[PDB]
Design a protein around this motif. Structure first.
Motif, PDB file in Angstrom:
ATOM      1  N   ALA A   1     -22.917 123.482 -41.053  1.00  0.00           N
ATOM      2  CA  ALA A   1     -22.634 124.546 -40.108  1.00  0.00           C
ATOM      3  C   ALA A   1     -23.836 124.865 -39.237  1.00  0.00           C
ATOM      4  O   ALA A   1     -23.673 125.259 -38.075  1.00  0.00           O
ATOM      5  N   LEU A   2     -25.048 124.725 -39.770  1.00  0.00           N
ATOM      6  CA  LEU A   2     -26.215 125.105 -38.986  1.00  0.00           C
ATOM      7  C   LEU A   2     -26.920 123.919 -38.347  1.00  0.00           C
ATOM      8  O   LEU A   2     -27.829 124.123 -37.539  1.00  0.00           O
ATOM      9  N   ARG A   3     -26.497 122.695 -38.639  1.00  0.00           N
ATOM     10  CA  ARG A   3     -27.080 121.541 -37.967  1.00  0.00           C
ATOM     11  C   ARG A   3     -26.689 121.492 -36.487  1.00  0.00           C
ATOM     12  O   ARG A   3     -26.050 120.526 -36.066  1.00  0.00           O
ATOM     13  N   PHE A   4     -27.048 122.507 -35.685  1.00  0.00           N
ATOM     14  CA  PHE A   4     -26.782 122.465 -34.248  1.00  0.00           C
ATOM     15  C   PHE A   4     -27.961 123.033 -33.466  1.00  0.00           C
ATOM     16  O   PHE A   4     -28.696 123.886 -33.964  1.00  0.00           O
ATOM     17  N   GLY A   5     -28.107 122.588 -32.223  1.00  0.00           N
ATOM     18  CA  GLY A   5     -29.217 123.039 -31.406  1.00  0.00           C
ATOM     19  C   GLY A   5     -29.402 122.128 -30.204  1.00  0.00           C
ATOM     20  O   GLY A   5     -28.475 121.442 -29.785  1.00  0.00           O
TER      21      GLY A   5
ATOM     22  N   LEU B   1     -27.292 115.955 -34.338  1.00  0.00           N
ATOM     23  CA  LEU B   1     -27.364 117.391 -34.088  1.00  0.00           C
ATOM     24  C   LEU B   1     -26.250 117.886 -33.126  1.00  0.00           C
ATOM     25  O   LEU B   1     -26.267 117.591 -31.930  1.00  0.00           O
ATOM     26  N   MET B   2     -25.300 118.661 -33.650  1.00  0.00           N
ATOM     27  CA  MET B   2     -24.234 119.238 -32.835  1.00  0.00           C
ATOM     28  C   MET B   2     -24.782 120.187 -31.768  1.00  0.00           C
ATOM     29  O   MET B   2     -25.874 120.749 -31.884  1.00  0.00           O
ATOM     30  N   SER B   3     -23.976 120.389 -30.728  1.00  0.00           N
ATOM     31  CA  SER B   3     -24.369 121.240 -29.619  1.00  0.00           C
ATOM     32  C   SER B   3     -24.015 122.704 -29.832  1.00  0.00           C
ATOM     33  O   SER B   3     -24.635 123.574 -29.212  1.00  0.00           O
ATOM     34  N   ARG B   4     -23.051 122.997 -30.694  1.00  0.00           N
ATOM     35  CA  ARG B   4     -22.547 124.348 -30.863  1.00  0.00           C
ATOM     36  C   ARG B   4     -22.071 124.500 -32.293  1.00  0.00           C
ATOM     37  O   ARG B   4     -21.718 123.506 -32.936  1.00  0.00           O
ATOM     38  N   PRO B   5     -21.992 125.726 -32.804  1.00  0.00           N
ATOM     39  CA  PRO B   5     -21.451 125.923 -34.155  1.00  0.00           C
ATOM     40  C   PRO B   5     -19.985 125.525 -34.211  1.00  0.00           C
ATOM     41  O   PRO B   5     -19.319 125.338 -33.191  1.00  0.00           O
ATOM     42  N   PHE B   6     -19.474 125.394 -35.433  1.00  0.00           N
ATOM     43  CA  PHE B   6     -18.054 125.111 -35.615  1.00  0.00           C
ATOM     44  C   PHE B   6     -17.221 126.353 -35.313  1.00  0.00           C
ATOM     45  O   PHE B   6     -17.608 127.475 -35.654  1.00  0.00           O
ATOM     46  N   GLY B   7     -16.062 126.155 -34.690  1.00  0.00           N
ATOM     47  CA  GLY B   7     -15.158 127.269 -34.450  1.00  0.00           C
ATOM     48  C   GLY B   7     -14.013 127.400 -35.448  1.00  0.00           C
ATOM     49  O   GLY B   7     -12.863 127.618 -35.053  1.00  0.00           O
ATOM     50  N   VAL B   8     -14.300 127.289 -36.741  1.00  0.00           N
ATOM     51  CA  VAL B   8     -13.247 127.258 -37.748  1.00  0.00           C
ATOM     52  C   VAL B   8     -13.853 127.643 -39.087  1.00  0.00           C
ATOM     53  O   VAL B   8     -14.977 127.253 -39.410  1.00  0.00           O
ATOM     54  N   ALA B   9     -13.104 128.410 -39.867  1.00  0.00           N
ATOM     55  CA  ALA B   9     -13.520 128.763 -41.214  1.00  0.00           C
ATOM     56  C   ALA B   9     -12.612 128.079 -42.228  1.00  0.00           C
ATOM     57  O   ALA B   9     -11.487 127.673 -41.910  1.00  0.00           O
ATOM     58  N   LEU B  10     -13.096 127.972 -43.467  1.00  0.00           N
ATOM     59  CA  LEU B  10     -12.404 127.188 -44.477  1.00  0.00           C
ATOM     60  C   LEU B  10     -12.236 127.997 -45.744  1.00  0.00           C
ATOM     61  O   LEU B  10     -13.157 128.709 -46.162  1.00  0.00           O
ATOM     62  N   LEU B  11     -11.050 127.899 -46.335  1.00  0.00           N
ATOM     63  CA  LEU B  11     -10.846 128.259 -47.730  1.00  0.00           C
ATOM     64  C   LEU B  11     -10.869 126.966 -48.531  1.00  0.00           C
ATOM     65  O   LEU B  11     -10.104 126.039 -48.245  1.00  0.00           O
ATOM     66  N   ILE B  12     -11.763 126.890 -49.505  1.00  0.00           N
ATOM     67  CA  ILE B  12     -11.942 125.695 -50.310  1.00  0.00           C
ATOM     68  C   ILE B  12     -11.567 126.064 -51.735  1.00  0.00           C
ATOM     69  O   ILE B  12     -12.226 126.904 -52.367  1.00  0.00           O
ATOM     70  N   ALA B  13     -10.497 125.456 -52.234  1.00  0.00           N
ATOM     71  CA  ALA B  13      -9.963 125.748 -53.555  1.00  0.00           C
ATOM     72  C   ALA B  13     -10.061 124.510 -54.438  1.00  0.00           C
ATOM     73  O   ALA B  13      -9.823 123.386 -53.979  1.00  0.00           O
ATOM     74  N   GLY B  14     -10.433 124.709 -55.697  1.00  0.00           N
ATOM     75  CA  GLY B  14     -10.536 123.556 -56.569  1.00  0.00           C
ATOM     76  C   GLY B  14     -10.714 123.941 -58.019  1.00  0.00           C
ATOM     77  O   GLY B  14     -10.729 125.116 -58.389  1.00  0.00           O
ATOM     78  N   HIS B  15     -10.848 122.916 -58.840  1.00  0.00           N
ATOM     79  CA  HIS B  15     -11.100 123.094 -60.256  1.00  0.00           C
ATOM     80  C   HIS B  15     -12.168 122.110 -60.702  1.00  0.00           C
ATOM     81  O   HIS B  15     -12.139 120.931 -60.342  1.00  0.00           O
ATOM     82  N   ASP B  16     -13.101 122.604 -61.501  1.00  0.00           N
ATOM     83  CA  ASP B  16     -14.037 121.756 -62.200  1.00  0.00           C
ATOM     84  C   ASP B  16     -14.165 122.311 -63.609  1.00  0.00           C
ATOM     85  O   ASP B  16     -13.676 123.402 -63.910  1.00  0.00           O
TER      86      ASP B  16
END
Ligand SMILES: [Cl-]
Ligand SMILES: [Cl-]
Ligand SMILES: [Cl-]
Ligand SMILES: [Mg+2]
Ligand SMILES: [Mg+2]
Lengths: 244, 241, 232, 241, 6, 236, 241, 196, 250
Positions: free
Chosen positions: F113-117, F119-134
């Protein structure tokens, strides 16, 4: 026109580089710090404002060594100072690796000067926010130097920079009068503590901690060492006495 | 190496360069595709703001990607070539390394991915192009139709249109496409497509072009004469009381 | 401030660096965290912050080696970057020289890493503050890291919102807790009191309290959850 | 920002940054002048040490570039030392690559060309300095060549630089108009140094002490600078007419 | 207002 | 723009990051609920036109057999975050012969998400719900944003309906909920905040259980669950 | 740092137009008119020099018609210096294709690549577009005589007759009137000269302000670039002198 | 030393290519098609070092296929053989050069003439009425030099080829497990399935 | 600390103008007058060596510059730009021609090469156009004598005669009157001196004028004998004396 003070390498219409002059303002807001050249060495001293009794005493050292014979102290943005010093260490290593002889003090001044001047050449960097006093003993004398964000530097009999620079300079000009035949390494340590104490009155707001270092052909064999322990207390005393 | 951020967020959460890229798509000739029961049809408008142009050699707006997949587009023409080339190349690399041609969805997802990279890379502006990608998966008879847009989003459509006057053509289509019973013949699928271009093309068959994709790499473009037969017959169904 | 705060490469006409100053503002919105040390141990206490009643409590303390660790207040990502760089240096010192990295020297390295991002165009300052503790060959140590680059050695301090409460308290309690030698439970107790002067409409719970200690014969250890019940 | 901030043309066709760079050359308030003898070259420049805390021996704007080339700078010391290092380097490289000593004029041209660059490439500022080069060239005889922030260079019968540049130039012009030659017909360099200090004084309307001046001489063999004591000797002689 | 800060 | 992509605002926030947060507020809704029986992810499909084949709307995706992901915002921005997560989870298995932990995989995504400047030009415009089991921290749900931060939630809703939907979850969630209870409970909150009337065509359900991993419910299954909800409500 | 002075040259207007492409087109619209007409048995290139003085030498002058290849030529409208860059890369590409396949490059493939290059300066790299538009007149063993046009955007299209540069709406209207699909080369020659004489911003149309070239049918294809005298002749034959 | 044979009769071009694949001491496969179709009317056969052989082939294939779709046009046989020669000539001075030889047979639907091309791993290219790679030329060129006529029917060509194959079975130490034969004519590429 | 100006400093304005090129032309217009004249057996180029201090030595600075043994250049505008272009031009005539063909470039091609360098300063990242116009004159075997003008845009055109800089409009008009297609070289030298005479205000003599010719080959200027087929050089700068000697016949 207007606008000439927002980028760095920009000439104003009256020939100035305002961003460098603005850097000096950070220097002037810094702690007061000085250098005195004597008959066979140099002394360095600096004011450590005790922001809070929470600071460990003796333990936020400000004077830095370069190689084994050079002392550096600065006023202003401390992290810029370390940076410049780091560069100085590399520059002193390169010189010794090729030439074997440790870097002569004027040659070191120009290494620092050239680098600092470099940061007034491009608007992709800002100038150094520190004025730096440094010096040492080399194959033919002691040398004291001071270096401004502009990259300007000259050799001094004595030097000061920071909030208390004017008291310091005035007190140093005095030093070139009484004691003009020459000033010995030891007297110069004492005088250093006096001047820092006197210069501190423009920062009387906070309590402060004295820190002195020296580099004497006769008292340190030419190597840069910190005035600590007993000699330190004697100079602190000499300051209290001569201020009252 | 010019790396300035050209597509960035503005305070209301918009990425103006992507949105302004969509505006170029709206400014472009209309394109349409309709799913049949056993085929897909792509139709395009020829802007009539010109003449006298040689149409033998001016590039058609329907391009073959592989022998089972075609792509049409609305938007800046020059940008379209870059997508078509990247895609034609990726079509061959898939054959080289997987020993199977691309599925229509996969090739769409690739094109859409290229489009997205150009919306968050320094030094580049988004593509002023939207695509309709249609064809048949290898060894499969279900027709496929997908659309992509400069932002990189993609999805599939029973029928869909892009470009100038696409708002109307979608209304027309939305009120003429029985999801439950789609055009049962190629002959009547091209009819429903030509019909919807006639709502916005005014007119002629030298300003419309059609391309029929049928399963197992059966791709053909109609001639003006072939197309006019639907243009004139469409105009005969014209009132009529 | 108007025209002179669009990057880290512009001085104000008075000598200020707004981009660095705005970075400090990020710390002030961070949650309170406290550090203090005697002659034998050094302690971190942090108030962890949650988002909903349904969320976890953002971790605040990060071990860097067996003898060094830190607490963070501000942009948690930047602490990841900085604490991870700190782990690398601790590790380099171990591998190349068979030498534990001095707390004083970690401090120097941190200052220099941050200063790069106040003379570099296209970079930004770090938006986080760090309290660093450790036991090395010269004893207990506490450092405070500021995004300006300024790293300072103290007996105790606090950073984060409402941190003045604890900071003021530590200034009173100074002569008392320096002397808490050979009694770690009593130095933690001291810290938990110091951090209390910074609560407002909240009391310390098992879910939000977080404590680290290090010292002579006590490798850097972190207590969360049921482990910290002892101290409430 | 404007055509005022970087090295690009204004509609008048002007590079304001080169002009403001010139202005900074006077920011030291120091004048310098150079003349040619029969077989030597002398440069004179003011020395102003106002601070009792400064080490006067380290305050100089005269540089020994090679064994044969001296360079005196009009302008701020940091840019001047920057220029001085680069020339010392260029002269050592010239010797390694080509096998004879770099001529005064060639170095001037080479530094002038570097100046031109900062005039055209936007990311480098000009240097606020004017470079006066002196040598006794093995081919050309005594030589004076000067460089400014515009990338200009030329050679001079004699020259002068600084805030009272004009009076010194017009002074020296008249003396050569009277003598009908382009040089001090004197076989001692000591006398030529005296000529320089003399005609300098007469145009600034100010007397000089042994600490107000700074002197450099160039002979066939080498280029050396005078001591305050060698200067006092010259001034004494001037005081006896 | 907004607690994206640790 | 004027400032510069990596600029701090005077209140200590990264402009581009907080502007990026606004676009997520405009995204279709997504909700996840955790139970000792598994974790459920649901999303509003929100097709624009009726000709858009609502099956191709892919806003819930598999990362590994034990990790699923639901997205909300500028969804095109998620392809590479997903590609990176799937590569990260598979690489971890190649290097250590074990499943990656859900939090470790979440941390890896947030590092992008922060690899921009500039190297991506802008932050991501999307949020994630990450569900799982370990096997170390059981069933888990995480919220990962373009700020680079992430929190673990017992339940969380992101997107348009979130403010109200989250307020509902704060009332309705408890620790002994069952998998089936949270299924309906997600369907409830969805229709509550959706702009269309909920059916098995504009909403999609999915879960993660230890024994079967991550499955996406087919329209048939969800439909029978929507009805099951219509009857329970009410029924007072 | 420097981002203050970057005119973003590859960005969209809020309407979806490419600022620099549109402005580049404005530039081109003040350029000497050039016309291309395809006959049933040949192709004609004619364009007008805007640069004319008594002392200008025209025997050794080229400004608008350039040979790409033995079988392809271009008429240039815009920055002639931008044009030469684009020409040589094209002149090379043609030789690369010949080297690889031992066949002459088909006209469209060369035009496609040259437009592909232009298109690039439109989407990445932060440079300005090429202020150039091209009329391509070529012949190949697959599509025969061909006539194409490309502009700063990188878009290209094919034509029966077309014009670029100044006064094209005027000239294009005239070409629509008198053009017939069955023309021979000499008809097109006259249609070409007679259109220019009606649209010139000049007093009368003289040979010293024209360039002229024809590619026509031995069983191969010759390519002829008229000399000043040959133009003077053709101007009388058609009665314009 | 696989068998790569080629003959250009009047109306078509015929490629015969050994069917065996031997890895050291065992014969791994006896049904190997040492051929790739470069386009509907151009066929390339190949023999040489392992792996290099097919990799190069499939690379040239995908390249010609890319050209076909991009230009909606089928490159002449001459031009394909020129693209192939250039590719091999680049490899020969590269780090690891492709160790591959090829015959290229295609029907030039534009000249309505068949064409046969022989190119070695060095990029040496020659147009021939008949050709072979490796040792196969040593036994068969004397037969072909004798019986070959430029106006032979496809059927006459097949017969002449059968002779070459039998001479290869008599005098050649390796069991090459027979050949696969393919014809390229105005109508494309068909594989002669009954070659006994 | 690096050229972070990857983008063009010359861009199209909404009017279609390339601003920075126009301004460069403005600077050329301010420049001192220079001119070139083509004859039937030679070419001549001249400009004014207007020193900027009488203490300057005018000869230490050539505004007329030998590119190849058969090509000369003069300019109007910013000298420092011209100077680095003469350096670049001499090198290119070697690197891109002499080292390849063993011949010097012919006039049109070298002009083309300089043109390319200036075009690039019109489009590459972080640079301004050149602030000069060049008049290049020379002779090659297959094109004979020729004269070309090169502008900051990168455009060039061939002339029978022309002038650039300050008094160009006056001198251009003056040249159109007195130029014919039968002039001998010595004739053009005369017309050259006269046209310059109008444009010049102070002293006007062989120490304040620079003037060179492309004419017959001077085997006395070769430096070596014994290779009979090495002719040249056709370029020659006139001496201070040779200028005065012709000024009386004015
Ligand atoms: Cl490929
Ligand atoms: Cl130096
Ligand atoms: Cl081989
Ligand atoms: Mg890219
Ligand atoms: Mg090629």
């Amino acid at each position: 026109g207007t606008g000439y003070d927002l980028s760095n390498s920009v000439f104003s219409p009256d020939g100035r580089n305002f961003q460098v002059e603005y850097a000096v303002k950070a220097v002037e807001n810094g702690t007061t710090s000085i250098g005195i050249k004597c008959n066979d060495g140099v002394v360095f001293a600096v004011e450590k404002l005790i922001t809070s009794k929470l600071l460990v005493p003796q333990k936020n050292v400000k004077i830095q060594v370069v190689d084994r014979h050079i002392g550096c102290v600065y006023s202003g943005l401390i992290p810029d100072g370390r940076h410049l010093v780091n560069r100085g260490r590399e520059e002193a290593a390169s010189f010794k690796k090729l030439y074997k002889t440790p870097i002569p003090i004027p040659a070191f001044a120009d290494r620092l000067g050239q680098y600092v001047q470099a940061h007034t050449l491009y608007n992709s960097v800002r100038p150094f926010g520190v004025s730096t006093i440094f010096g040492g003993v080399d194959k033919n004398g002691a040398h004291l130097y001071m270096l401004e964000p502009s990259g300007s530097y000259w050799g001094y009999k004595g030097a000061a920079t920071g909030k208390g620079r004017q008291s310091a300079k005035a007190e140093l000009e005095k030093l070139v009068d009484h004691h003009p035949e020459g000033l010995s390494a030891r007297e110069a340590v004492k005088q250093a503590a006096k001047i820092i104490y006197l210069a501190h009155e423009d920062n009387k707001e906070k309590d402060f901690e004295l820190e002195i270092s020296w580099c004497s052909l006769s008292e340190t064999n030419g190597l840069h060492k910190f005035v600590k322990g007993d000699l330190l207390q004697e100079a602190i005393d000499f300051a209290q006495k001569e201020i009252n | 190496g010019y790396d300035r951020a050209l597509s960035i967020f503005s305070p209301d959460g918009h990425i103006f360069q992507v949105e302004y890229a969509l505006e170029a798509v709206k400014r472009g000739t209309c394109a349409v595709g309709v799913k049949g029961k056993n085929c897909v049809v792509l139709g395009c408008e020829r802007r009539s703001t010109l003449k006298l142009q040689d149409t033998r050699i001016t590039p058609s707006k329907v391009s073959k990607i592989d022998s089972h997949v075609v792509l049409s587009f609305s938007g800046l023409n020059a940008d379209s070539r870059i997508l078509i080339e990247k895609a034609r190349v990726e079509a061959q690399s898939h054959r080289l390394t997987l020993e199977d041609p691309v599925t229509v969805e996969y090739l769409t997802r690739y094109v859409a991915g290229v489009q997205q990279r150009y919306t968050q890379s320094g030094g580049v502006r988004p593509f002023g192009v939207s695509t309709l990608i249609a064809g048949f998966d290898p060894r499969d008879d279900e027709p496929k139709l997908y659309q992509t847009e400069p932002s990189g989003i993609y999805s599939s459509w029973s029928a869909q249109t892009i470009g100038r006057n696409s708002k109307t053509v979608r209304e027309f289509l939305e009120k003429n496409y029985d999801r439950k019973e789609p055009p049962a013949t190629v002959e009547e699928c091209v009819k429903l497509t030509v019909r919807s271009l006639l709502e916005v093309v005014q007119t002629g068959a030298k300003n419309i072009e059609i391309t029929v994709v049928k399963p197992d790499s059966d791709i053909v473009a109609l001639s003006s004469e072939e197309i006019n037969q639907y243009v004139t017959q469409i105009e005969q169904e014209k009132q009529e009381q | 401030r108007n025209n002179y705060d669009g990057d880290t490469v512009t001085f104000s006409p008075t000598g200020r660096l707004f981009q660095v100053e705005y970075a400090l503002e990020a710390i002030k919105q961070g949650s309170v965290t406290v550090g203090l040390r005697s002659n034998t141990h050094a302690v971190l206490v942090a108030l962890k912050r949650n988002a909903d009643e349904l969320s976890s409590y953002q971790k605040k303390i990060i071990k860097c080696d067996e003898h060094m660790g830190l607490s963070l207040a501000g942009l948690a990502p930047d602490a990841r970057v900085l604490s991870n760089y700190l782990r690398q240096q601790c590790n380099y010192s171990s591998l190349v020289f068979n030498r534990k990295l001095a707390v004083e020297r970690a401090g120097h390295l941190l200052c220099d890493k941050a200063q790069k991002n106040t003379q570099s165009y296209g970079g930004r300052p770090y938006g986080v503050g760090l309290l660093i503790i450790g036991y090395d060959k010269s004893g207990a140590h506490l450092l405070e890291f500021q995004p300006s680059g300024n790293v300072t050695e103290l007996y105790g301090t606090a950073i984060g919102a409402r941190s003045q409460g604890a900071k003021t308290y530590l200034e009173r309690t100074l002569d008392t807790f320096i002397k808490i030698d050979g009694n770690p439970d009593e130095l933690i107790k001291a810290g938990v009191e110091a951090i209390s002067q910074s609560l407002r409409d909240e009391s310390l719970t098992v879910d939000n309290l977080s404590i680290a200690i290090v010292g002579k014969d006590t490798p850097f250890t972190i207590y969360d959850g049921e482990a910290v019940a002892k101290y409430i | 920002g404007y055509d005022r901030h970087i090295t690009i043309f204004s509609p008048e066709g002007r590079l304001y940054q080169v002009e403001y760079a010139f202005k900074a050359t006077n920011q030291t308030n120091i004048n310098s002048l150079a003349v040619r003898g029969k077989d030597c070259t002398v440069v004179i420049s003011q020395k102003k040490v106002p601070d009792k805390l400064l080490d006067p021996t380290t305050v100089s704007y005269i540089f020994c570039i090679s064994r044969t080339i001296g360079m005196v700078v009009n302008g701020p010391i940091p840019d001047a030392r920057n220029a001085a290092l680069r020339a010392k380097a260029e002269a050592a490289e010239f010797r390694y690559k080509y096998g004879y000593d770099m001529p005064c004029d060639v170095l001037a041209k080479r530094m002038a060309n570097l100046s031109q660059i900062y005039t055209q490439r936007a990311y480098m500022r000009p240097l606020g300095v004017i470079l006066t080069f002196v040598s006794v060239d093995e081919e050309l005889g005594p030589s004076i060549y000067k460089t400014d922030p515009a990338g200009y260079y030329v050679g001079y019968k004699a020259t002068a630089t600084g805030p009272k540049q004009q009076e010194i130039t017009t002074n020296l012009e008249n003396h050569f108009k009277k003598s009908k030659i382009d040089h001090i017909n004197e076989e001692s360099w000591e006398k030529v140094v005296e000529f320089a200090i003399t005609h300098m004084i007469d145009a600034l309307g100010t007397e000089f002490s042994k600490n107000d001046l700074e002197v450099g001489v160039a002979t066939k063999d080498k280029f050396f600078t005078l001591s305050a004591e060698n200067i006092e000797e010259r001034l004494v002689a001037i005081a006896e007419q | 207002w907004r607690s994206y800060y640790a | 723009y004027d400032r510069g992509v990596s600029t701090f605002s005077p209140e200590g926030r990264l402009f581009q990051v907080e502007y990026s947060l606004e676009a997520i507020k405009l995204g279709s809704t997504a909700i996840g609920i955790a139970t000792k029986e598994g974790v459920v992810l649901g999303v509003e499909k929100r097709a624009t036109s009726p000709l858009l084949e609502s099956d191709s709307i892919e806003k819930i995706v598999e990362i590994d057999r034990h990790i699923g992901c639901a997205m909300s915002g500028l969804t095109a921005d998620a392809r590479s975050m997903i590609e990176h997560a799937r590569t990260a989870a598979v690489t971890h298995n190649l290097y250590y012969d074990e499943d990656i932990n859900v939090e470790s995989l979440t941390q890896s995504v947030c590092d992008l998400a922060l690899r921009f400047g500039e190297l991506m030009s802008r932050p991501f415009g999307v949020a994630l719900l990450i569900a799982g089991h370990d096997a170390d921290d059981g069933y888990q749900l995480f919220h990962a944003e373009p700020s680079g931060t992430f929190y673990r939630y017992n339940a969380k809703a992101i997107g348009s309906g979130s403010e109200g939907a989250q307020a509902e979850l704060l009332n309705e969630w408890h620790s002994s909920l069952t998998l089936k209870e949270a299924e309906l409970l997600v369907l409830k909150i969805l229709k509550q905040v959706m702009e269309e009337k909920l059916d098995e065509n504009n909403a999609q359900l999915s879960c993660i259980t230890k024994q079967d991993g991550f499955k996406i419910y087919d329209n048939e299954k969800t439909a029978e669950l929507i009805k099951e909800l219509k009857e329970k409500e009410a029924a007072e | 740092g420097s981002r203050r002075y970057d005119s973003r040259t590859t960005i969209f207007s809020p309407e979806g137009r490419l600022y620099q492409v549109e402005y580049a087109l404005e530039s081109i619209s003040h350029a000497g008119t050039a016309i291309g007409i395809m006959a049933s048995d040949g192709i004609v290139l004619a364009a007008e020099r805007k640069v004319t003085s008594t002392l200008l030498e025209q025997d050794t002058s080229t400004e608008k018609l350039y040979k790409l290849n033995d079988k392809i030529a271009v008429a240039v409208a815009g920055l002639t210096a931008d044009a030469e860059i684009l020409i040589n890369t094209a002149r090379i590409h043609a030789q690369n294709y010949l080297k690889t396949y031992n066949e002459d490059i088909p006209v469209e493939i060369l035009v496609r690549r040259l437009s592909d290059i232009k298109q690039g300066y439109t989407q990445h790299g932060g440079l300005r577009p090429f202020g150039v538009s091209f009329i391509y007149a070529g012949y190949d063993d697959r599509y025969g005589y061909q006539l194409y046009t490309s502009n700063p955007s990188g878009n290209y299209t094919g034509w029966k007759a077309i014009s670029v540069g100044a006064n094209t709406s005027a000239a294009q209207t005239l070409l629509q009137m008198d053009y017939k699909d069955d023309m021979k080369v000499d008809d097109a020659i006259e249609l070409a000269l007679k259109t220019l004489s009606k649209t010139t911003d000049s007093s009368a149309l003289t040979y010293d302000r024209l360039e002229f070239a024809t590619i026509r049918k031995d069983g191969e294809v010759y390519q002829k670039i008229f000399k000043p005298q040959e133009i003077k002749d053709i101007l009388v034959k058609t009665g314009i002198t | 030393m696989d068998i790569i044979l080629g003959i250009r009769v009047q109306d078509s071009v015929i490629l015969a290519s050994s069917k065996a694949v031997t890895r050291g001491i065992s014969v791994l496969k006896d049904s190997d098609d040492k051929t790739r179709q470069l386009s509907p009317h151009t066929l390339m056969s190949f023999a040489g070092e392992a792996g290099d052989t097919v990799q190069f082939a499939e690379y040239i294939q995908a390249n010609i296929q890319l050209y076909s779709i991009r230009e909606d046009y089928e490159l002449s046989p001459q031009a394909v053989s020129s693209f192939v020669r250039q590719e091999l000539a680049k490899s020969i001075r590269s780090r690891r050069p492709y160790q591959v030889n090829v015959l290229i047979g295609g029907y030039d639907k534009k000249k309505n003439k068949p064409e046969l091309y022989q190119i070695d791993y060095l990029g040496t290219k020659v147009e021939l009425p008949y050709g072979a790679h490796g040792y196969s030329g040593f036994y068969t060129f004397s037969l072909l030099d004798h019986h070959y006529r430029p106006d032979m029917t496809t059927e006459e060509g097949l017969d002449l080829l059968k002779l070459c194959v039998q001479e290869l079975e008599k005098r050649m130490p390796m069991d090459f497990k027979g050949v696969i034969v393919k014809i390229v004519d105005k109508d494309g590429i068909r594989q002669v399935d009954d070659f006994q | 600390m690096t050229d972070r100006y990857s983008f063009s400093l010359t861009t199209f304005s909404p009017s279609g103008k390339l601003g920075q090129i126009d301004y460069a032309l403005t600077a050329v217009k301010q420049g001192v007058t220079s001119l070139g004249i083509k004859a039937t057996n030679g070419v001549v180029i001249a400009t004014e060596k207007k020193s900027s201090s009488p203490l300057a030595m005018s000869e230490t600075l050539s505004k007329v510059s030998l590119l190849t043994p058969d090509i000369g250049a003069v300019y109007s505008g910013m000298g420092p730009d011209y100077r680095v272009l003469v350096d670049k031009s001499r090198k290119v005539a070697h690197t891109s021609y002499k080292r390849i063909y063993g011949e010097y470039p012919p006039t049109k091609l070298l002009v083309s090469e300089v043109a390319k360098i200036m075009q690039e300063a019109t489009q590459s990242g972080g640079v301004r156009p050149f602030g000069v116009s060049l008049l290049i004159a020379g002779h090659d075997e297959f094109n004979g004598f020729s004269l070309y003008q090169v502008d900051p845009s990168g455009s060039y055109f061939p002339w029978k005669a022309t002038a650039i800089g300050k008094g160009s409009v006056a001198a251009k008009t003056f040249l159109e009157k007195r130029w014919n297609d039968e002039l001998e070289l010595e004739d053009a030298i005369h017309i050259a001196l006269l046209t310059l005479k109008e444009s010049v205000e102070g002293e006007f003599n062989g120490d304040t004028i620079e003037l060179a010719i492309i004419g017959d080959e001077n085997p006395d200027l070769l430096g070596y004998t014994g290779i009979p087929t090495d002719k040249g050089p056709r370029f020659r700068k006139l001496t201070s004396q040779e200028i005065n000697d012709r000024l009386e016949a004015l």
